């Protein structure tokens, strides 16, 4: 799998613009703004989201790279083929944004508490 980062998932990004908008999996209800469900700097799109109401929305995952570092990303948007997260999370996981996209990234699902504990 290949991972990248997008500048749109910033703190003032409205949740109505992502696939998880209201419906049953909508996160806008309790958290109408991005910066609490994932935490703030641990949010990104993921390939397991279908659309307006993905069944895997709100799922914690750990991303690991060959350098030896990992962060927790909570599902929020869908991806064509790879995991995309905020540029701040990308720089922290790799060290800089010069890499752009890194393939062969290992990912594993963990308890939700770990995502909130890591982000905070």
Calculated CA dihedral for residues 87, 99, 48, 79, nearest 10 degrees: 80
Helical segments of the chain, H only:
87-94, 112-119
Residue 24: CB atoms within 10 Å: 10
Count of domains for the chain: 1
Q: Which residues contact 97 (CB under 8 A, 6 or more apart)?
A: 5, 87, 90, 91
d(CA 85, CA 43) in angstroms, rounded, equals 6
Q: What is the CATH number of the domain that holds 7?
A: 2.40.40.10
d(CA 120, CA 114) in angstroms, rounded, equals 10
DSSP state of 25: T
d(CA 116, CA 29) in angstroms, rounded, equals 18
User: Residue written as tokens 């641990």?
Assistant: 42
Bridge partners of 84, per DSSP, are 4, 45
Residue 7: CB atoms within 10 Å: 8
Nearest to 82 by CA among 49, 120, 109, 36: 49
Q: Between vectors from CA 76 to CA 74 and to CA 24, what angle results, nearest 5°?
A: 115
Solving technique for this entry? NMR
The burial of 27, by beta-carbon neighbours within 10 Å (0-12 exposed, 13-18 middle, 19 or more buried), is given as buried
Helices (H) and strands (E) in the chain, counts: 2, 6
For 12, the 3-state DSSP assignment is coil
For 87, the 3-state DSSP assignment is helix
- Side-chain-side CA neighbours of 71 within 13 Å: the count stands at 25
Strand 69-78, strand 83-85: pairing: unpaired
DSSP state of 40: S
Q: Which domain covers residue 111, as residue numbers?
A: 1-120
């Amino acid at each position: 799998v290949s991972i990248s980062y997008d500048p749109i998932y910033a703190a003032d990004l409205s949740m109505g613009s992502v696939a998880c908008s209201n419906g049953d999996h909508g996160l806008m209800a309790q958290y109408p703004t991005l910066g609490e469900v994932p935490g703030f700097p641990n949010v990104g799109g993921i390939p397991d989201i279908a659309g307006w109401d993905s069944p895997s929305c709100g799922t914690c995952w750990k991303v690991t790279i060959p350098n030896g570092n990992s962060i927790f990303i909570r599902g929020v948007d869908s991806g064509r083929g790879g995991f995309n997260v905020n540029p701040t999370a990308f720089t922290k996981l790799v060290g800089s944004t010069e890499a752009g996209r890194v393939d062969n990234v290992n990912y594993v699902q963990v308890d939700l508490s770990n995502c909130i504990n890591g982000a905070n």
